[PDB]
Amino acid sequence: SDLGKKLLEAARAGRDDEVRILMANGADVNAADVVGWTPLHLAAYWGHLEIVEVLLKNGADVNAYDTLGSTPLHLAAHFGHLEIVEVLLKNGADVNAKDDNGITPLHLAANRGHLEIVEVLLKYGADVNAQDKFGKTAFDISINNGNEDLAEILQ
Amino acid sequence: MPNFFIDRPIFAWVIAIIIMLAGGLAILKLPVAQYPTIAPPAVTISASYPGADAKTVQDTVTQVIEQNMNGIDNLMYMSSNSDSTGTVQITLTFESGTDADIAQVQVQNKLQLAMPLLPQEVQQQGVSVEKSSSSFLMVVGVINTDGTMTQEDISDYVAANMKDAISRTSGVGDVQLFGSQYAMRIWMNPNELNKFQLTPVDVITAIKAQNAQVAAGQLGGTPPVKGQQLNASIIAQTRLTSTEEFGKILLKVNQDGSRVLLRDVAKIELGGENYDIIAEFNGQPASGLGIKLATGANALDTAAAIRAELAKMEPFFPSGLKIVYPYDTTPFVKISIHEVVKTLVEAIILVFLVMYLFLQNFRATLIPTIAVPVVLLGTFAVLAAFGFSINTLTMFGMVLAIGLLVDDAIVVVENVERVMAEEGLPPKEATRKSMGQIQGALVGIAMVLSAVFVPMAFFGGSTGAIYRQFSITIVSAMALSVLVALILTPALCATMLKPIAKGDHGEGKKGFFGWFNRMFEKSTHHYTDSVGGILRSTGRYLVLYLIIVVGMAYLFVRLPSSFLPDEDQGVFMTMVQLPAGATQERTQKVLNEVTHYYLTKEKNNVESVFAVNGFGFAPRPQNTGIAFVSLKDWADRPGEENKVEAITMRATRAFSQIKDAMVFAFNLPAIVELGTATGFDFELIDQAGLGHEKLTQARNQLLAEAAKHPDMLTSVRPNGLEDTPQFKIDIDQEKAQALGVSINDINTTLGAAWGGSYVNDFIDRGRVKKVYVMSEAKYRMLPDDIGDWYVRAADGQMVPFSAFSSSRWEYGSPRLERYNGLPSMEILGQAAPGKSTGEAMELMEQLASKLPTGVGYDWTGMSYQERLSGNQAPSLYAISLIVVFLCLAALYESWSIPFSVMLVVPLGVIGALLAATFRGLTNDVYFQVGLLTTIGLSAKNAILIVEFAKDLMDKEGKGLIEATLDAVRMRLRPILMTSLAFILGVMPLVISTGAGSGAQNAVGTGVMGGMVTATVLAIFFVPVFFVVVRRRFS
Amino acid sequence: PGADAKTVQDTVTQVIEQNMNGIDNLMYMSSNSDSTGTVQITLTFESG
């Protein structure tokens, strides 16, 4: 839809006041581009907290998955957006969501050494023994990266 | 010197003949072009990395070349674009006056410092170093009407049979093929490759082995066995020449004995090097040649020579092939030349008529008709000596000088005719006396006008080079006008004019001329009475002058700024911008709709539409397109409704309806390099390795703040592209090493299949052409296709790409910008209505100083050299006024009297500003140069009134008022004759609505309006100035 | 090296000559392609 595409640009750009008007006019929150990214996906990636909260209040799918199976929590966790990770998990985001590679939000958080996010995901019941297509855990990633702090947290 | 040539009329004629021959010779040999070189010298470094993303290009090519651009002289700034079309373009802009050849060779030489550090694929494609130019002589289109040839087929034919002959044609500088010659396209099938346990690596290895030139040697080569009879070259393997041969390339022999050929795992055809760009002309497939004019060549000779060559090629064309000229400037340049020659010839005819109306003898009308052409011809000889060309600027420079040239002619002859009529002296002694009165002033005038015009040539940058074209043209014409006025015209006067009896003013004649003389002698008495009454009450006129000076200053600020007026050149453009990530097919849909509109709704105006998919102002992504609309002849489009401005507005409003695509039409600028007046070019710079993401956030922060000042800033936008979704694939190094799969085989298989790989060259009908291996379209479209590509392990097992890879969606730049070697983002914008560019720039600097740490800025292009030229103006205005004052001070032998002449300036300027404001025109270059010629001629009128008045006071001991009244009485006729002749002369330019009328209007309007007020006010105000000044300093 | 006059002309001589356009004061251009592999392209310019 016309407004659905306008909401995608607004959510990405972090234009809080435009998103406010679009939610009032009823811009489709399940609007998706060619790669299957919702306004929530974009907000989570670019790290726009207020818009993440406003979209979830306006009945956005917290477990919306792109054409490669990635959710907003995947993007939030990977790019170190602690507050968005918390807000998503509180609104019922699948903490053990596997993409098409078998990669979880814990894997992505571990790979970028986001200690706070890892502990938040573990608190909300992230499967620490969860393996990707290469049979790798978040621990295997921490050892390979040489992250001694993270290696300790996952033990 | 006048006295010398009055006694020596033959010598005077010899000087005139030599000037005529030099001028006549100059006119025939002088090069012709629409505009001269204006932009400062620029060198571009262009490299292709097939299948490369923006960051790959930037980090392996752009950064390496930028770091090695050291020790090069007169470099102003360096900019670069690395984009996901697999392209880098580094533009190095040099100081005005830099030798472009020395600039190019220094860049080129330093590029070899970097060539061995670039990727093999980039070294293979080659890195082009070229002198930058954004002005084509014409665009020759080549189309197929019977639908038997694709754009790839047409492009190959043009490359093979046309381009070289056109490149060889006289006056042709550069030729750009719109497309490429054929490339041997190997379209690989992954299913067939996996079926035979083969990869793209095996295809490339086989092509390199079985398509190659191998050096053998000689039979009986030196040193020989003595007694050898035979010395012959050994020819071994030579390159393949056909698709048939490439299909027969052996890939492997199976165990059973059967043979896997290249045609068994790939489709093989002659195709294009690049498929990103699709060119159409009225919907039909098209290629073309972009032809640029060579240095100092004749545009009209070259265009005629190009059409002569294409005519010779006509017979050998395949059936359906047809030449079209969607863009050609030479028809416009013909009209520009012709209209200026018509103006100059009509100007001479008008002087003749005005000369006869007042003087009423054919002998008198004959002298300006001789003197003016001699000066014009001479001007061309001086232009040639300066290395100038016959162009729009130099030609309109002469039209703007007409008023000054005809005045020199009228003033000399009229003053002789008056002296004879008033004193009854014979022509010779009358001319001697007459020149005695004006020869001192004419020399003073030459110096004063030089002081006005010469400083205009010392402005820097692009606008500086434009003003320099008018300056040297007008100064040269004016300089020769005074030389002819001191040499030829006196000689002509003394030998050709027939005597007049003392007190004979033609009042005793009968018919129209007897009436006119009685009317004008009566009108002269009414005039001197009026000045008599004005000089009794000078107080109220000083007040009326201050009102004029205030009204002038008010209209100056109210008049918006520009450079050159927009012209109907029978062409305009339509941008087709779809959402980011939109495919080629979707951009074609919109282009087909844009083409369909122009050939139906503008059927009576539009000749053709050149729809270029995957192109804007440069090769752009699949979501971008452009349509070059070529209109019919100006004669077939009568009225304001059928002009570019009207068609543009209609199309833009019509295409507003188009959904999920921004489409809008716009006219071409006169010169593209200038841009828009009140428009700025800003560079946001990453000064502390912040990275792309942080610089974007800083850009968004600056753009947000600029939007909160609509009062000052308008349309402040990025010039670049936004981040788009990109497919990140991670090769698992451990899984690859565990399965015995090499990373080189993985990366080549991916790169060759999805991106394409330039393998080697082959020879197609005697021309060396490229061999490209790539996946057939249907196996490199979607992420699921990745898993269909198999790589052979060391143990011989075929491993799918899915086994050792993982993918995810991320965002990244499809075009990364750099400025002076640092990450940058170009921001365009303009000063709001009623605000100056300098004010808009000041705010942008203020907003930029409140951005995050490590984010710097700089001004480039028009903004860079606008700040340069802006710092010069005050100094050049100052020198001009100081030298003018000093020249007048020397002429009159007085520090005070100069002021009486210098006070005339506003009298012409007010009229120009009124006419421009009324017509809805702008403060453009033509208007500004027009002011100086109007100011120049009003100053000339004032100089002679003051000289006559002062001389009467000095020599005949007359009073201030007595001398002033006798002065303005004598100067009335010659002032009215010049004004009448010149106002009528520029009237055709004012009302013109044809081709090049935009410039004609800008020249005529300001001059006509200016001349009317300059004439009417000066004859009443100049006598006030002299009296008020003399009184104040007595 | 090892190329006949024809191969040399197609892959070198013509490739260079095609790019030898838009040069100031070029009076004439003469070249020869040899079975030794040698190319010589002489550009003679206007007097002065």
Ligand SMILES: CC(=O)O[C@H]1C[C@@]2(C)[C@@H](C[C@@H](O)[C@H]3[C@@]4(C)CC[C@@H](O)[C@@H](C)[C@@H]4CC[C@@]32C)/C1=C(\CCC=C(C)C)C(=O)O
């Ligand atoms: C009749 C008229 O209008 O002027 C004609 C007549 C014209 C002024 C010609 C241009 C130019 O040779 C002129 C010169 C000074 C050229 C040098 C000599 O040979 C002179 C003996 C000759 C006399 C007049 C002439 C022959 C005209 C032009 C310009 C032609 C150019 C183009 C591309 C349109 C013109 O037609 O506009």
Ligand SMILES: CCCCCCCCCCCCO[C@@H]1O[C@H](CO)[C@@H](O[C@H]2O[C@H](CO)[C@@H](O)[C@H](O)[C@H]2O)[C@H](O)[C@H]1O
């Ligand atoms: C009263 C004094 C007036 C002074 C006149 C000033 C004239 C200045 C303008 C340029 C005049 C000469 O300009 C000359 O025009 C001729 C027109 O036949 C051009 O001739 C060229 O264009 C024409 C028109 O397409 C072709 O047919 C022709 O084959 C080609 O050679 C020359 O390339 C140009 O050099």
Ligand SMILES: CCCCCCCCCCCCO[C@@H]1O[C@H](CO)[C@@H](O[C@H]2O[C@H](CO)[C@@H](O)[C@H](O)[C@H]2O)[C@H](O)[C@H]1O
């Ligand atoms: C590099 C330095 C350049 C210097 C620039 C100065 C420019 C000067 C402007 C031109 C001035 C014209 O120069 C003018 O010459 C004529 C003829 O000789 C003189 O003419 C004079 O004639 C007789 C002398 O027999 C006097 O009685 C009379 O008062 C005066 O008109 C003027 O006194 C002088 O003003």
Ligand SMILES: CCCCCCCCCCCCO[C@@H]1O[C@H](CO)[C@@H](O[C@H]2O[C@H](CO)[C@@H](O)[C@H](O)[C@H]2O)[C@H](O)[C@H]1O
């Ligand atoms: C249509 C727009 C054009 C307007 C242009 C404006 C520029 C000035 C135009 C000059 C016309 C002035 O015309 C002239 O005015 C003066 C006023 O001082 C008159 O002068 C008369 O009145 C004044 C004051 O009342 C007396 O001092 C004087 O003795 C008397 O002769 C002249 O009789 C008249 O001929």
Ligand SMILES: CCCCCCCCCC(=O)OC[C@H](CO)OC(=O)CCCCCCCCC
């Ligand atoms: C007799 C006194 C004449 C003085 C004329 C001074 C003008 C110098 C022109 C110059 O050097 O610069 C070229 C300039 C480029 O921008 O051209 C111009 O912009 C036109 C100049 C406008 C003049 C208005 C005068 C205002 C009166 C208060």
Ligand SMILES: CCCCCCCCCCCCCC
């Ligand atoms: C090509 C132009 C030549 C014009 C020559 C003019 C001839 C008249 C000069 C005076 C002749 C009589 C001797 C004083």
Ligand SMILES: CCCCCCCCCCCC
């Ligand atoms: C209405 C007041 C009288 C004004 C007279 C002006 C005379 C102008 C004559 C100029 C004609 C060339």
Ligand SMILES: CCCCCCCCCC
């Ligand atoms: C001897 C006849 C005078 C002619 C009078 C002309 C007046 C009218 C012309 C406009």
Ligand SMILES: CCCCCCCCCC
């Ligand atoms: C720039 C030159 C100015 C000269 C002024 C002289 C004034 C002297 C008055 C007696």
Ligand SMILES: CCCCCC
């Ligand atoms: C004194 C007269 C000299 C003439 C120069 C051309």
Ligand SMILES: CCCCCC
């Ligand atoms: C060489 C041509 C001269 C023409 C003079 C009008």
Ligand SMILES: CCCCCC
């Ligand atoms: C520049 C003008 C100065 C003259 C003062 C009398």
